[PDB]
């Protein structure tokens, strides 16, 4: 899966 995808809850 993508290490640059959104890491925050929203």
């Amino acid at each position: 899966v993508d290490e640059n995808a959104n890491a925050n809850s929203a």
Partner: antibody
């Protein structure tokens, strides 16, 4: 006041382990992803690892993969970096940083850093 | 990996002048995920610009970012003494990589 405070830096013999911590305050820690970044003496910045808001996904730089583990305890507003099999080239100031609210995982708040020296 | 090359290595200017700092990526940066950071001696980095052109909270409007694709610029329009520092660019679209920094020093 949003603030990050790292601790746990010290001297470690090559091959041994150390755990760093980062204490967060002034925001809802469980809503933010978090990074570790490091800076060796006289050099630039090198990203180390990222962790999702809820501790699910974790990703690592190739230079630390298999040796370092990023983790967090949302109940204690705390971020951790477990460093194993340390080498001289891991000597650096280690910073924790918060993931910003605009698009993408840029670093919008940084701690003051903690120093790790790998040496016999 | 995406290599970011900053130029010049050192910029020597005086307060009141305009500074232009450049960052070139080896591959096109995805989603304009390009940020600029400031670092003073003994201090942690501080975010200035993200999304190539969005100013961070508390950053004064003399800082502005532009560019797209592989070529990005940070402009400081009228330098103040507190602006003399090292500046790093960073891409956060494919892993997380930094430029090697440009030092902005006082010319005397």
């Amino acid at each position: 006041q949003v603030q990050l405070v790292e601790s746990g830096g010290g001297v470690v013999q090559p091959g041994r382990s150390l755990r760093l911590s980062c204490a967060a305050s002034g925001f809802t820690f469980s809503g933010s992803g978090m990074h570790w970044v490091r800076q060796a003496p006289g050099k630039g910045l090198e990203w180390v690892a990222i962790i999702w808001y809820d501790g699910s996904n974790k990703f690592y730089a190739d230079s630390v993969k298999g040796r370092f583990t990023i983790s967090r305890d949302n109940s204690k507003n705390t971020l951790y970096l477990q460093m194993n099999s340390l080498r001289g080239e891991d000597t650096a100031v280690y910073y924790c940083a918060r993931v910003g609210d605009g698009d993408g995982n840029y670093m919008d708040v940084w701690g003051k850093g903690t120093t790790v020296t790998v040496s016999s | 990996e995406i290599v970011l090359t900053q130029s010049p290595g050192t910029l020597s200017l005086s307060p009141g002048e305009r500074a232009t700092l450049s960052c070139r990526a080896s591959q096109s940066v995805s989603s304009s995920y390009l940020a600029w950071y400031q670092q003073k001696p003994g201090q942690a980095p501080r975010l200035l610009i993200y999304g190539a052109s969005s100013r961070a909270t508390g950053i004064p409007d003399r800082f502005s970012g532009s560019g797209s694709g592989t070529d990005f610029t940070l402009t400081i329009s009228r330098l103040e003494p507190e602006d003399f520092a090292v500046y790093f660019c960073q891409q956060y679209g494919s892993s997380y990589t930094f430029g090697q920094g440009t030092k902005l020093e006082i010319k005397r």
